[PDB]
């Protein structure tokens, strides 16, 4: 089918004899000459140590969210390390994280138990999900968890770690409450520390060194990637090649991984927008990161 155009015509018609006429055999496409990768001039490594190497993780009721931005993030070392028992990515692929660029990455760190580790997932129902930490239905990112029994378990129990047990209403996704107001239930007779059908909202739990694996403390860090609709600030460890125009290339603008020929534009992008789409929702204009 590629020897000569007559043979391509014979292949298309599925016959070795063709009649007089003009036949639409195949399509002609200009193959790219080179591959272009253009990532921003950020060079400093991301402070992922301060999230995973943390001495103590914040409690689930009041977790810690860190703004990871303006740095080069290497997720290959995070995924390749065998320390993390659970490494589940929902909207992305863990091995594809080095080729992508994100405008902002947020890491939420908290400690839960083995029986509640499955509750950290989109569309889940449970104590942690309903009252402590709710993940969005359209959650894109990765969930990282590893055993902290060697880290947080103490003889007699570790009482620095708190989970909410009672709340008036379920939490919307990414909702944190630190009210610590006493729980009022029943006929609402509790206005103080203790009352009828009244309990403390923050139910502490102590982690024993010999406790069961399901009740062992688990350090959980979730990376909430928000994909590329604004200019990127945190990117993978991909080298940036020189920009070439007027030649068909496999351009990779902040992970856009398109293909086409690049020309100078007279279109004025607003400062907050970095991409330009069209009717078919295909990227028409891009702003060079460098």
């Amino acid at each position, epitope marked *: 089918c590629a020897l000569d155009p007559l043979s391509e015509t014979k292949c298309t018609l599925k016959s070795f004899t063709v009649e007089k006429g003009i036949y639409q055999t195949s399509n002609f496409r200009v193959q790219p000459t080179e591959s272009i990768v253009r990532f921003p001039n950020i060079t400093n490594l991301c*402070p992922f*140590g*301060e*999230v995973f*190497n*943390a*001495t*103590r993780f914040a409690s689930v009721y009041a977790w810690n969210r860190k703004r990871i931005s303006n740095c080069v993030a290497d997720y290959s070392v995070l995924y390749n390390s065998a320390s993390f028992s659970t490494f589940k990515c929902y909207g992305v692929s863990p091995t594809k994280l080095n080729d992508l660029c994100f405008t902002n990455v947020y890491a939420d760190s908290f400690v839960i138990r083995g029986d509640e580790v499955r509750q950290i997932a989109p569309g889940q129902t449970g104590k942690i999900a309903d009252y402590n930490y709710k993940l969005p239905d359209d959650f894109t990112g990765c969930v990282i968890a590893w055993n902290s*029994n*060697n*880290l947080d*378990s*103490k*003889v*007699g129990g*570790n009482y*620095n770690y708190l989970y909410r047990l009672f709340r008036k209403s379920n939490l919307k996704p990414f909702e944190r409450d630190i009210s610590t107001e006493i729980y009022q239930a029943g006929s609402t007779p509790c206005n103080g520390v203790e009352g009828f059908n009244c309990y403390f909202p923050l139910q502490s739990y102590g982690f024993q*060194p010999t406790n069961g694996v399901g009740y062992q403390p688990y350090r959980v860090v979730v990376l909430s990637f928000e994909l590329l609709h604004a200019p990127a600030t945190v990117c993978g460890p991909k080298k940036s090649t020189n920009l070439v125009k007027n030649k068909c290339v496999n351009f990779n603008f902040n992970g856009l991984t398109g293909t086409g020929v690049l020309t100078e534009s007279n279109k004025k992008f607003l400062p907050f927008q970095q991409f330009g789409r069209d009717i078919a929702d295909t990227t028409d204009a891009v702003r060079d990161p460098q």
Partner: antibody, heavy 119, light 106 residues
Framework: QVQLQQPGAELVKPGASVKMSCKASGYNFNHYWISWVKQRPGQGLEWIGDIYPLSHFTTYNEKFTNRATLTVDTSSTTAYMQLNSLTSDDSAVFYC?????????????WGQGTTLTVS | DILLTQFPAILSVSPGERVSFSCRASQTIGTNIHWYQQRINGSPRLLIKYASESISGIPSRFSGSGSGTDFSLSINNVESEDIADYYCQQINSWPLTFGAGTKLDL
């Protein structure tokens, strides 16, 4: 009272291992971390590593991640570091401090200081 | 890896005055600085925990303030026993790091 015993002024030939002794008493040994700090004469303190006596979990500094290896004896409530290749530059004071974990992490109690020198 | 620096590496003070040190971290930590002192031929001793509150047995002159990245150590009154080496220690995440070094002069 709480007292941490640490002998010092030990003489060792360069290129040989040392077995530091860090005897601690006066507190529950399973509820507190104990750490080591290296200080050159006239220079700032430099971290070495930590340990969990209950679960024998250790973290090492990047410079000392392979040279210094740490072990703990729960029976004698004494921590140790050993199997290191000392050099002439390694001559420094080696402290042993108790890390107050599960609470205000403050390095509450410090040792006298093992002034190891080599020649 | 969090890095700490002190601009006043060596400081000269007079008895009875107030001075303040500085310790800025590479990354924000949120009050995870402990200030230590080491006298000549002595051992380090904890003075101020979490860079904000103090402990028992420490004179009230040693006052700590600061949050985020930049931290400071303030001493109300200077006497003969205040001449030592004051060190800044970050404890937010491993590896734990100590200060470059601050010295006091008469």
């Amino acid at each position: 009272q709480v007292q941490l015993q640490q002998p010092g002024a030990e003489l060792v030939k360069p290129g040989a291992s040392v077995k530091m002794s860090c005897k601690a008493s006066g507190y529950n040994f399973n509820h507190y971390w104990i750490s080591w700090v290296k200080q050159r004469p006239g220079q700032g303190l430099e971290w070495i590593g930590d340990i969990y006596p209950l679960s024998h979990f250790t973290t090492y500094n990047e410079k000392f991640t392979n040279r210094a290896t740490l072990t703990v004896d729960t029976s004698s409530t004494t921590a140790y570091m050993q199997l290191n290749s000392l050099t002439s530059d390694d001559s420094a004071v080696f402290y042993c401090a108790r890390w107050d974990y599960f609470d205000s992490r403050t390095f509450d109690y410090w040792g006298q200081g093992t002034t190891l020198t080599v020649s | 890896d969090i890095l700490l620096t002190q601009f006043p590496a060596i400081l000269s003070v007079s008895p009875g005055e107030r001075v303040s040190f500085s310790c800025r971290a590479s990354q924000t930590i949120g009050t995870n600085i402990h200030w230590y002192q080491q006298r000549i031929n002595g051992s380090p001793r904890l003075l101020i925990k979490y860079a904000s509150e103090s402990i028992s047995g420490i004179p009230s002159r040693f006052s700590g303030s600061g949050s985020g990245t930049d931290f400071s150590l303030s001493i109300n009154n200077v006497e003969s026993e205040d001449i030592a080496d004051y060190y800044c220690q970050q404890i937010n995440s491993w590896p734990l790091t100590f200060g470059a070094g601050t010295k006091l002069d008469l």
